[PDB]
Design a protein around this ligand. Structure first.
Ligand code: RIS
Ligand code: MG
Ligand code: MG
Ligand code: MG
Length: 340
């Protein structure tokens, strides 16, 4: 039962959930990784990790991925959530120096992860392990694209740090541009490719239908997170949220901003259904009769299939995950799973 303010009947009726068969092993293996990389305290791992549903989120998204690819993605995605938590905590505690140093180390570790596998900062060491593993699946040109994209994500996190320190709420257009980076749209899009076992040529992944289907899938995920994470984020003095920019710059009430965010999320779905037809037509066209063609066709089709799976995985994740259950916290400003 999804709250009426958050319910999307089109997702429930037309985007049936999928789950990767490796998910049972994935859940425990990522929990063990969080424990052994010291990315969460042992008692917080035991009490909260499974309930945060991070592995479920990936296992409902990258269908068809090799077990080892899914494992590295899930470890990275759990790392990403812990990094969001650390970033938030550095902000709340005014640890500008610790954040700046961390920011620099992630930039460096991103380009040479193997050199950082045993760094003193467990968050940097965890990052490097997952990234080194992700760099092992596809050619160096894919690794360099992942790094280029994540360098941009790190700097968007830095911009968020400056905004919240200075109490600046981005304008709507400014936020929509920033949100494609803080949510890491293009990282999740990159990671479709090791999941289907094929680095896509630029001509293929920059095709207008592939690009637009990829964009809309991520816009939905980020803006649906905004809709669902708004209570926790208002309680935690987070300023980055489409609803908050609407209240601040467009003078909407809370109920009207929630309504406008809802409508924008709903439009993402029906825009995606239109372009999905074009992206799958393009997949069919790539099967020109040659071996390379059949391979590229299959990879594009699998990737567009997972762009669709992202809709249902993110939807149900926000109603299942303990990450957003702010009403159950004694201190609504400090989630119990964060290192405070
Ligand atoms: O769970 P959260 O904090 O609402 C979030 O989605 C965490 C997150 C960050 C980046 C990518 N995916 C999830 P955020 O982006 O900070 O709003
Ligand atoms: Mg956050
Ligand atoms: Mg964030
Ligand atoms: Mg959020």
């Amino acid at each position: 039962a999804v709250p009426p303010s958050l319910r999307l009947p089109v997702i429930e009726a037309a985007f049936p959930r999928q789950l990767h068969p490796y998910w049972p092993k994935l859940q425990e293996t990522t929990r063990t990784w969080l424990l052994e990389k010291r990315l969460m305290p042992a008692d917080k791992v035991e009490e909260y990790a499974d309930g945060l549903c991070y592995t479920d989120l990936m296992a409902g998204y990258y269908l068809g991925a090799p077990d080892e690819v899914l494992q590295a993605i899930a470890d990275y995605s759990a790392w990403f959530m812990v990094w969001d938590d650390r970033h938030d905590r550095d902000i709340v505690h005014g640890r500008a120096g610790a954040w700046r140093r961390l920011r620099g180390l992630l930039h460096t570790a991103l380009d040479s992860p193997g050199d950082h596998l045993h760094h003193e900062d467990t968050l940097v060491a965890g990052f490097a392990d997952s990234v080194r593993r992700l760099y092992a699946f596809l050619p160096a040109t894919w690794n360099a694209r992942f790094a280029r994209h994540f360098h941009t994500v790190i700097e968007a996190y830095d911009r968020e740090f400056h905004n919240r320190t200075r109490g600046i709420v981005p304008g709507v257009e400014e936020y929509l541009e920033l949100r494609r980076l803080t949510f890491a749209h293009w990282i999740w899009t990159d990671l479709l490719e090791p999941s289907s076992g094929c680095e896509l040529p630029d001509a293929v992944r920059k095709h207008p239908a592939y690009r637009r289907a990829a964009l809309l899938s991520q816009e939905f995920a980020a803006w649906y997170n905004d809709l669902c994470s708004l209570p926790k984020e208002i309680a935690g003095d987070e300023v980055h949220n489409l609803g908050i920019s609407l209240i601040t710059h467009h003078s909407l009430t809370l109920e009207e901003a929630i309504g406008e965010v809802r409508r924008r999320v709903e439009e993402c779905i029906t825009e995606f259904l239109a372009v999905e037809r074009d992206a799958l037509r393009f997949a069919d066209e790539l099967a020109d009769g040659t071996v390379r063609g059949k391979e590229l066709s299959g990879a594009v089709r699998a990737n567009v299939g997972n762009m669709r799976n992202w809709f249902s995985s993110v939807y149900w994740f926000h109603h299942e995950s303990g990450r957003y259950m702010v009403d159950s916290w004694d201190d609504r400003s400090t989630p119990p799973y964060v290192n405070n």
